[PDB]
């Protein structure tokens, strides 16, 4: 019955936990509870290591007990909430956090936890308010501070920015060195001024989280295959993604599983997510050699087995530290070779990841210590995209002359050719080359349809769709799931763009912008007097913030023009209206990059050190356009301005991008696949020859 005994035990276990020795800690707590079953704090403690070991179901039951025993235990509620949160029961997590606050209004953690839920839900403004409260209540509070900081980042609140950055760094530094799990998230790390050293460390500790979660499974190391004997000479490659369905990953690589050489390769896709219905999921399922739904198999043990089971030589992690990820699977080491690829733009910083697949531009050898994995280079760029398949109606365009611009009123359509031929007067500017519809009555009707805001019209029997109503005419087209079967009109007037300006665009989510980035753009716009910047309300709540800072830089409001976010296909297609994209140098447009290039719209970039900031450069290089790549702020602005003012040049460059986007290897997925295949072989040779992972710079 003895509380004093039980008390003592507890103290020791706390200690045991201090020295990371979770193993032992747990054993002690459970003994404490055996001596004293009505021991609130024991229950609580035990609960939170069970939580850390990922034994949620049980961890939960303990928190329940603690609370029942000691109903004023605000702390217990708050953690129990976190458990529920991780259990996907947001409903219940929410209840806990709020009970905590109600029981003890002064309790900073619950405020912060609450904010977190909001944050994950999208509601940033409320996330912020709650963080601020938590911080007011407890001013030294790293999780709060760092999350808040990212919220602010996301809506471009740049109050105290410089000094905020210092503090972040300072907090990380402190946390790392005091061996505490750092408050900045590995994915976000990429946005703040931290040493590559630090970024890597962050990734590192987050990796260890998986270790704890699989260690309690006590699984013996796996037996890995050593030859391609059992797999009939074919190397077996496992792609693991929670994004097989409508998500950027699939919009880049859906074609690839399909394009592997069956003679030498057997492809296994492991979905970490339930089939969302979309044709993305359909196609990958249709085309992979084996499609395996792991969202079915919650247990990582079982799932890891199921991989090993399949006899995978190389396992590919398309997720890194993003939503949906199950790195535990990688941490269990079911396959001999395990590589990061495509999905996540940074190091895993983790022992269980052997390679990261990248390229010479994105990750030159100078900055190789950013990464904990060995570099495996693709030959040009490691980036790829399905645009060629998804969006073949943007392979060609036509325009209308209402006075000759390539980007004022644009038509694309699979049957576009066919239609022009029914037309009387089509002049044909050379470069393929661009057909120009003169100001007929036809031209008028079209432009009138646009102006009247009508859905679509018919002309000589061809449907001519207003490219703002795509979802109304065919939602499958609008999302990328189908190729449109109409001819689509796209116009500056649709988005309230000036018919006679230089349009600089950036379609990234606004969190990729910082003060200095906006700065540069300000300078460009001042030096290109007849120009506007085109941006996305992404989130909308960020727009007034940009507008604000825009004006302290002394730009009249009307110099920056916001549009709403649009369905994948409209978003891509309307990039044809821009003259030049200006890439965020803090974090490059990745998918966004490919989308802008597909429209034929040169992009000006300023590669940094972090992988994430060198991707646009890498893409441009593969495309063949080094004159778009700045070495510094100065050069960037010049390149911008030149293209803004020298219309001759612009016409040249734009024409190049447009042609190159076909002729270069960038958007060629077949070639890409084949490259990816050699690179795989290389990796296997090297392992099958008996070596440990080493850089594959070919």
């Amino acid at each position: 019955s003895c509380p004093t005994h039980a008390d003592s035990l507890n103290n020791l276990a706390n200690i045991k936990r201090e020295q990371g020795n979770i193993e032992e800690a747990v054993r002690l707590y459970r003994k404490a509870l055996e001596v004293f079953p009505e021991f609130a704090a024991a229950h609580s403690n035990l609960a939170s290591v069970l939580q850390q070991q990922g034994k949620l179901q049980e961890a939960l039951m303990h928190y329940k007990e603690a609370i029942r025993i000691s109903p004023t235990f605000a702390d217990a509620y708050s953690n129990m909430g976190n458990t529920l949160k991780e259990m996907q029961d947001v409903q219940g997590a929410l209840q806990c956090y709020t009970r905590a606050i109600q029981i003890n209004p002064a309790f900073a953690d619950a405020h912060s936890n609450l904010a977190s839920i909001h944050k994950d839900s999208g509601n940033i403004p409320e996330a912020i308010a709650s963080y601020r409260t938590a911080l007011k209540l407890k001013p030294d509070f790293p999780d709060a501070y760092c999350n808040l900081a990212h919220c602010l980042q996301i809506v471009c609140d740049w109050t105290d920015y410089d000094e905020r950055m210092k503090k972040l760094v300072s907090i990380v530094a402190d946390q790392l060195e005091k061996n505490r799990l750092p408050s900045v998230h590995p994915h976000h790390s990429m946005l703040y001024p931290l040493s590559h050293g630090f970024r890597k460390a962050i990734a590192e500790r987050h990796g260890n989280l998986c270790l704890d979660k699989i260690n309690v499974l006590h699984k013996p190391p796996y037996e890995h295959p050593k030859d391609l004997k059992l797999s009939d000479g074919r190397l077996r490659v496992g792609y693991v993604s929670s994004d097989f369905g409508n998500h950027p990953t699939s919009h880049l690589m859906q074609s690839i599983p399909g394009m592997h050489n069956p003679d030498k390769f057997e492809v296994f896709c492991y979905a970490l997510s339930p089939d969302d219905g979309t044709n993305f999921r359909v196609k990958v399922m249709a085309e992979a050699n084996h499609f395996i739904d792991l969202s079915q198999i919650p247990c990582n043990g079982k799932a890891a087995d199921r991989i090993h089971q399949d006899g995978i030589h190389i396992l590919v992690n398309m997720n890194g530290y993003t939503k949906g990820a199950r790195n535990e699977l990688f941490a269990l080491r079911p396959a001999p070779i395990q590589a990061m690829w495509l999905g996540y733009p940074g190091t895993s910083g983790a022992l269980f990841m052997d390679y990261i697949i990248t390229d010479q531009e994105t990750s030159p050898a100078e900055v190789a210590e950013q990464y904990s994995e060995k570099l495996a280079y693709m030959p040009h760029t490691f980036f790829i995209g399905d645009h060629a398949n998804m969006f073949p109606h943007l392979k060609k365009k036509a325009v209308i002359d209402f006075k000759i611009y390539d980007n004022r009123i644009v038509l694309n359509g699979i049957d576009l050719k066919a239609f022009l031929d029914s037309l009387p007067d089509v002049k044909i500017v050379k470069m393929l080359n661009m057909p120009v519809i003169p100001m007929n009555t036809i031209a008028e009707a079209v432009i009138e349809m646009i102006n009247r805001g009508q859905i679509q019209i018919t002309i000589n029997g061809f449907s001519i769709s207003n490219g703002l109503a795509t979802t109304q005419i065919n939602n499958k087209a609008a999302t990328g799931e189908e190729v449109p079967r109409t001819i689509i009109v796209t116009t500056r007037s649709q988005y309230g763009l000036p018919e006679d300006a230089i349009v600089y665009c950036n379609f990234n989510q606004l969190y990729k912008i910082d003060p200095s980035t906006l700065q540069m753009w300000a300078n460009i716009l001042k030096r290109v007097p007849n120009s506007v910047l085109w941006l996305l309300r992404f989130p909308a709540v960020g727009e007034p913030n940009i507008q604000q800072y825009a004006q302290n830089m002394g730009l009249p409001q009307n110099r920056i023009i916001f549009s709403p976010v649009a369905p994948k296909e409209e978003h891509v297609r309307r990039g044809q209206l821009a003259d030049v994209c200006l890439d965020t140098p803090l974090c490059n447009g990745h998918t966004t990059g490919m989308d802008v290039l597909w429209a034929g719209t040169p992009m000006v970039t300023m590669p940094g050190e972090t992988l994430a900031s060198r991707v646009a450069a890498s893409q441009l290089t593969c495309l063949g356009c080094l004159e778009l790549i700045a070495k510094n702020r100065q050069e960037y602005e010049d390149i911008a301005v030149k293209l803004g003012t020298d219309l001759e040049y612009l016409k040249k460059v734009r024409g190049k991008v447009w042609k190159q986007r076909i002729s270069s290897p960038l958007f060629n997925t077949k070639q890409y696949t084949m490259e990816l295949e050699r690179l795989y072989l290389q990796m296997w040779e090297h392992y099958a020859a008996g070596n440990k992972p080493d850089h594959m710079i070919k």
Binding site: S116, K323, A566
Partner: peptide, 11 residues
Amino acid sequence: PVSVPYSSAQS
């Protein structure tokens, strides 16, 4: 109008 899925955090 519209929301598109994108690459995000985790926590």
